[PDB]
Amino acid sequence: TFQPLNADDVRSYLHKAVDFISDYYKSVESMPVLPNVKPGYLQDELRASPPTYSAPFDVTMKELRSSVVPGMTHWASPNFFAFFPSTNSAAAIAGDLIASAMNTVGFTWQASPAATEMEVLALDWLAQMLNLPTSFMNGRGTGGGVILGTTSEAMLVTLVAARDAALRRSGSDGVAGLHRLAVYAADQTHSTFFKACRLAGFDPANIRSIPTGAETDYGLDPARLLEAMQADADAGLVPTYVCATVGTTSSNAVDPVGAVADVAARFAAWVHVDAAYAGSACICPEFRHHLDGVERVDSISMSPHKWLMTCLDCTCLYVRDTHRLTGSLETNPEYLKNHASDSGEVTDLKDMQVGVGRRFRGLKLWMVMRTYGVAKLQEHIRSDVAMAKVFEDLVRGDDRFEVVVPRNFALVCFRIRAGAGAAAATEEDADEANRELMERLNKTGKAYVAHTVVGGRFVLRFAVGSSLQEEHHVRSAWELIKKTTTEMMN
Amino acid sequence: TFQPLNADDVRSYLHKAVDFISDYYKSVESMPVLPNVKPGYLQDELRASPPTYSAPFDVTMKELRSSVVPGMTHWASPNFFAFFPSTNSAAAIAGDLIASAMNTVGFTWQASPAATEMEVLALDWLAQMLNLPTSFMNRTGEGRGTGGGVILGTTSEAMLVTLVAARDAALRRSGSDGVAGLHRLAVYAADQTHSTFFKACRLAGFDPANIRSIPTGAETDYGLDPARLLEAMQADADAGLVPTYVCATVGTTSSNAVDPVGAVADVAARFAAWVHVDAAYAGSACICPEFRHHLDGVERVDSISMSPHKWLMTCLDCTCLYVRDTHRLEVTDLKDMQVGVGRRFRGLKLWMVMRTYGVAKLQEHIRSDVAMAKVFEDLVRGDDRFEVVVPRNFALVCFRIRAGAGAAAATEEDADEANRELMERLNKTGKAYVAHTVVGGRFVLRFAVGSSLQEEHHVRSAWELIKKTTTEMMN
Ligand SMILES: *Cc1c(COP(=O)(O)O)cnc(C)c1O
Ligand SMILES: *Cc1c(COP(=O)(O)O)cnc(C)c1O
Ligand SMILES: [Ca+2]
Ligand SMILES: [Ca+2]
Ligand SMILES: [Ca+2]
Ligand SMILES: [Ca+2]
């Protein structure tokens, strides 16, 4: 008699959720971006124990509005300027809602053919937008792709494939040889790469974080990479894997992809390109040069759930040889066996990821591309970049401020210059002035700004592109920075 | 001038999705559970390249109805009897829809306080339903517990991150220079533990030579024999290897065997090995007192996982990992014990399920699935041509046509072929989806009760179809 998917409840709960969402988008800008709660508030307000009895879903939604929403940081706010925006769209939310309701589990093709074939089709469409070489999709090709939750999983599975190949060819006695494998990335590489290395069992003493400096705009210098890898090879270590980043998290530095692949090829090392954020911009011809050389790397990942209007989670991994991944990741449990899998004519996507089950993530990505089309997706990239250029040129027109690195995409790095005011004579002073500025913009509730460290300096990041954000939001943000800065001097 | 979240599109697209969903549940039983498509069907229906121009969302929805839905396997069907059902609820779907619209990333408490606290809260609520010791809890009623939890994507992820924590702890215990001593670490699980666990062991860098799959037999109903485990671990310790981690499963995938948790924890304690309980499916049943005995001894293990996205009415992804006494590793989940950093607000839908329906309805949800499974099991036991292969512990029944049922099921090899034929004929009708396993070297049909729209009459009707089909086979 209890039917959790009864027709009446399905329609009314979801209608109430849609009403909440409409109200939320109309009212989010008026809320403070950052909340004013203390750790532990939530269990105080909800209770410590689940209710014994049921409640009308209107009560659940009231507690959502009363206790959850006021304790949120509003990533959807047009005044959220931190990290990178989680850009979103009605088509993507619609697609994920439909996937959640059908709730298929696509470990094998047979487990739901449409879920796997649409994932393959969405990956292929995106590869076409990105102008990936045909070696990255799939009649003799060996390339292909998989949608994963995170860049970390994409790093982990390619690290495992590279690890297993290095151990096999170098003659390791089982994993006795694992302590001789070495891996390489610039010191601007996201911290999650180094964690994935540790997960896969690489020795922390052999995880090389290569220094970068202002001379290359903090991109990886391939001469410094070659020297590190050669020194390891001369010491009896096995260079195994290099991560190059296009669009680093701190300052949007860009590693030279082709030059890195050429260096790594001297050692037969795996090369993965992390383009989690800036990959989406490469659907535009004027940005596609940042991926030159990708035809010589082993794998590349990017996240539509950053800059391609697809809600979390959605990270796309492309490899030139899927057999290298399935060799490490495949299983063949009896209860999943089926004629299609046996035939070799399908790829079961459990064999391209860590886990077994998986959501129908292909649906929302296809719905975004199918509904909006390439031209609109390109104009979405370009309008975000143009807003960022407005903000950069505003920073450059005020001699109290400096733009710390060149702007490649929609992120501007800036700070209060030294010698800008009495409260910033030295550069250690200017450091504390910028920290004060940031904490003052955040208490306002009309901004969320977070910082980074660029060449030993305290720097404010301004990451443009929250989906609700328009040009006037960025200009008003500039006025608020200017205004707050003046009040700090006197 | 293009606004992807403009008010008109948000309402109209979502209302069209809700209409599709309402229609889907009302009509999914009339569709064949398994589709009649061949590999590659989709690229013959839809365009090969992404469109340059935009299209009305109605066109997108028409292609979903015309080309996607006909190629799906309907997990939501009441006649879906395979694997474990992905049980679901209006509250869970609503919660995941709201999470997608807010679209926050909770990689720190500050990156969204409500999101981190709600995940912690949802985990602490479920821990109470499971009657876990406070050593697995973050907050208690008036203070703090000594443990913690995190909401992960898969049971495989839970195994991987606990394997990594145990691996690193054993390397320090054994004075390894970095990973130099990794080749000495051994790991253990029954041969009925999911193959994804042995894959996770290889992912974490354990040596294939040291990954132990312990044989099980019918004498323990394919549960792990702790004496066999002790023998294997003692042998490795005597050879200079370091016993590092044991996985005990409550409700194995193939036949729902149950490993003896407390006995496994005691054997493993003699070597200081990490013990993880995998209760991906059966964990949800342990919110009922008549099932909670299966978790006796959990106070002595190191970690336990279960997946609400199997049997607790929460759509994928939702796997809960609990770790005891996390100091050995203000209000935060164990964010370092996941593969990635930035992922969805998974806790909202889990809280909405518990807050909207309550503990009593969740328990009756478990009990009424088990009662349907018992009905099916008694129907099978009442027909001499069939046998129930192992005792039914939860809502999965394993059965087969036995040898001697007919002239076409004379030898045990013939019964194997007849069971495969029965399965394929059932699936061809579109009125069922059944899949198989192998138990004690015999081909066995699984019957997994619990798809959310499924009622008792669906189960009785499936049994009549099984009888009808078997009769037509034996001529
Ligand atoms: C966003 C970001 C990541 C995030 O990694 P996850 O594992 O998905 O959380 C990694 N690399 C770059 C360059 C990023 O911008
Ligand atoms: C579900 C199942 C698994 C597989 O889990 P994933 O979440 O798909 O990785 C592992 N163990 C058991 C007992 C299962 O039922
Ligand atoms: Ca195969
Ligand atoms: Ca924009
Ligand atoms: Ca209190
Ligand atoms: Ca039920």
Q: What is the CATH number of the domain that holds A158?
A: 3.40.640.10
Nearest CA in chain A to B192: A333
CB B319, CB B305: distance < 8 Å: yes
Query: Which residues line ion ligand 4, judged by CB < 5 Å?
Result: A 384
Distance A192 CA to ligand 1 centre (A): 7
Coil, strand or helix: which one is A4?
A: coil
Structural domain harbouring B213: 97-359
| A389 CA → ligand 6 middle, Å | 56
DSSP A290: G
Residues 418-447, chain B, touching A (beta carbon < 8 A):
435-438, 446
Q: Output the CA–CA distances (angstroms, integers) from residue B26 to A100, A197, A417, B95, in the order listed.
A: 16, 48, 64, 21
Please give, rounded to a whole number of angstroms, the shortest distance from the CA of A59 to a CA of chain B. 8
Helix (H) or strand (E) holding A423: none
Q: What is the DSSP string of A365-379?
A: HHHHHHHHHHHHHHH
Please list the active-site residues of A: 335
Q: How far is B402 from chain A (nearest CA, A)?
A: 19
Q: Give the helix ranges, DSSP H, for B174-321.
A: 195-203, 226-238, 261-269, 308-311
- For a ligand 2 pocket test, name from B157, B159, B191, B253 the mutation site with the most ligand atoms within 8 angstroms of its C-beta: B253
Backbone torsion region of residue A168, taken as left when φ is above 0, otherwise alpha when ψ lies between -120 and 50, otherwise beta: alpha
Give the SS3 label for residue B319: strand
Question: Which residues does a chain break follow in chain B (C to N more than 2.5 Å)?
Answer: 329
Cα-to-centroid distance, A54 and ligand 6 (Å):
17
Contact A112, B75 (CB under 8 A): yes
Distance CA B117, CA B115 (A): 6
Residue B216, amino acid: T
- Surface of A (369-398) touching B: CB under 8 A: 369-376, 379-380, 383
- CB B305, CB B337: distance < 8 Å: no
Residue A281: closest CA among A255, A252, A312, A242: A252
B2 annotated to a ligand binding site? no
Picking from B242, B221, B223, the residue whose alpha carbon sits closest to that of residue B233 is B242
How many A from CA of A349 to the centre of ligand 3?
11
Residues 309-338 on A with a CB inside 8 Å of B are 309, 311-313, 328-329, 331-338
Q: Which among B5, B118, B204 has the least Cβ separation from residue A25?
A: B5
d(CA A309, CA B100): 12
Structure tokens at A488: 């700090």
Compute how many other C-beta atoms are within 10 angstroms of the C-beta atom of residue A80: 26
Q: How far is A420 from chain B (nearest CA, A)?
A: 31
Please work out whether the CB of residue B155 comes within 6 Å of at least one atom of ligand 2: yes
Q: How far, CA to CA in Å, does A184 sit from each of A166, A193, A199, A300, B127?
A: 14, 10, 15, 16, 41
Angle at B408 between CA B405 and CA B411, to 5 degrees: 75
Q: d(Cα A136, Cα B376) in Å, to the nearest integer?
A: 49
Q: In this structure, what token pair is assigned to residue A2? A: 């209890």
Q: Which ligand is closest in space to the CA of residue A329? A: 3
Indicate which technique resolved this structure: X-ray
In sequence order, what are the beta bridge partners of B258? B250
The answer to whether residues B353 and B314 touch, using CB atoms and an 8 Å cutoff, is yes
Residue B129 at interface with chain A, using a CB cutoff of 8 Å: yes
Query: B280: which DSSP letter?
Result: T
Dihedral, A374, A306, A102, B80 alpha carbons, nearest 10: 110
B211 at A interface, C-beta within 8 A: no
Beta bridge partners of B187: B211, B245
Q: Please choose, from the candidates B252, B313, B348, the residue with its C-alpha nearest in 3D space to the C-alpha of residue B90.
A: B313
CA–CA dist A444, A441 (Å, integer): 5
φ, ψ (nearest 5 deg) of residue A32: -65, 135
Query: Are A449 and A415 a contacting pair, CB within 8 Å?
Result: no
Alpha helix (H) residue ranges in A134-254: 151-170, 191-199, 222-234
Q: Is residue B443 a contact partner of residue B433, using CB atoms and an 8 Å limit?
A: no
Q: In what order do the strands lie in the sheet with B242-249?
A: B148-152, B319-323, B303-306, B274-278, B242-249, B185-190, B211-214
Report how far residue B127's alpha carbon sits from residue B283's, in angstroms, rounded to the nearest whole number: 11
Cβ–Cβ gap B156/A356 under 8 Å: yes
CA dihedral A304, A307, A310, A313 (to 10 degrees): 60
Q: Which residues of A323-346 are buried (b: 16+ CB within 10 A; e: fewer)?
A: ebbbebbebeeebbeeebbeeeeb
Amino acid at site B156: S
H helices within A28-89, ranges in order? 41-45, 57-63
Q: How many whole angstroms separate alpha carbon A276 and alpha carbon A87?
A: 13
> If we measure between CA atoms, which residue out of A93, A377, A373 comes closest to residue B12?
A93
CA dist B459 and B372 (Å) reads: 7
Interface contact A355-B89, CB threshold 8 A: no
Structure tokens at B327: 């100091």
Q: How many residues are recorded in chain B?
A: 475
Output the CA–CA distances (angstroms, integers) from residue A75 to A180, B135, B232, B338, in the order listed: 43, 34, 52, 22
CA-based end-to-end distance of chain B: 70
| Long-range contacts, stretch A480-484, CB < 8 angstroms, 24+ apart | A480/A441, A480/A444, A480/A446, A480/A447, A481/A437, A481/A441, A482/A398, A484/A437, A484/A440, A484/A441, A484/A444
Euclidean distance between CA atoms A139 and A134, whole angstroms? 12
Structure tokens at A302: 């990017």
